[PDB]
């Protein structure tokens, strides 16, 4: 996947293709992680 973002000052996503912006912020994938219906890690992920 190519779509990346950083949160602007207003709190909302700013989209970009670059892996790091012009101002030196490292960018996040725009898309959520895959989900596997059988995921017994619900208990580990919930405590944090």
């Amino acid at each position: 996947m190519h779509l990346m973002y950083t949160l602007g000052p207003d709190g909302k996503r700013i989209y970009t293709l670059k892996k790091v912006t012009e101002s030196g912020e490292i960018t996040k994938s725009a898309h959520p992680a895959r989900f596997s219906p059988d995921d017994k890690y619900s208990r580990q992920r919930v405590t944090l």
Binding site: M1, L3, G11, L17, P32, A33, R34, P37, R43, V46
Partner: protein
Amino acid sequence: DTSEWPLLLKNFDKLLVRSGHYTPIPAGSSPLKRDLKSYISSGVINLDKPSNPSSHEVVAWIKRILRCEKTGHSGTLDPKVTGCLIVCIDRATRLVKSQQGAGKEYVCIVRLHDALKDEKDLGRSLENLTGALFQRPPLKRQLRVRTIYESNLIEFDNKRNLGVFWASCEAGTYMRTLCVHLGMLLGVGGHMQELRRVRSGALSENDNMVTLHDVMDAQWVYDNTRDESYLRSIIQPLETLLVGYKRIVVKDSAVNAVCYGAKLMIPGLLRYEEGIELYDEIVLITTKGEAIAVAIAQMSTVDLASCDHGVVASVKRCIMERDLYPRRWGLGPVAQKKKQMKADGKLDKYGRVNENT
């Protein structure tokens, strides 16, 4: 001060009053103060669909996880989109038709098949394809007219041959066609590289968008510790999808008629919003702030203030169940009283209640 109240109850005193006399029927609950089974049953999850299993498979997963009679959802046009999928649960399915014809916004990455001799050309061809467009469905496929209200090129990289832009459009508009069309308008050819949906109707990726992982956890947490707070945060009440609409609150006594599709009449009117124009789409609400139905207004606010008789609203779409507010005279179980008439005589020779006085 009432501008702190949740959802459809925000700014309740900023509604112009009609009647002072009425009595509150004990039935029903307010949307936020609903109870789990029926809260979920008027439920709506703003889901961040992952880029993969089809919208229908994903909704199926939500169904298997939550276990509920029905689930539907806001839109499917492209199968590899990530982003807003509004999954409706049970009674909320009543609102998917509207959610599907609702305006949608996208962030799209286009792949041009060769480098443009003028980079500025893309922004221009993108600007070219706004308003009423012609568009034929990709891969039963008839030519139709869809509108692109606004678009905006965010970023373009001619060497990589990828452009990323935003489009706001009518429901039914295909982004993968949009991409092919820029392709043709620029000569180099093109196609959609990837797509993310950033708003579906009244819900954007900013308004409490949760993931499949959240849905699994929220459900796990109840099934094991019986705490609801999670489950009750990822699920927003259908009344959410209706904040935009102007409001008419309906007398408790008149609520049930609306649930059967009947007009709302003046006798049934309790409060109304300012600046309601004849023919607008309004929401009709209980005093607890429940959405009874979405309706077409039939009287201007000025008419609604001065009018003695008349019909106020026709029902466009029933949301609320049919006998949620039945108008019980509060006598006492009729059948049960006939059991005590066997238990004490007073019943006639044939076994039927006596017309006596």
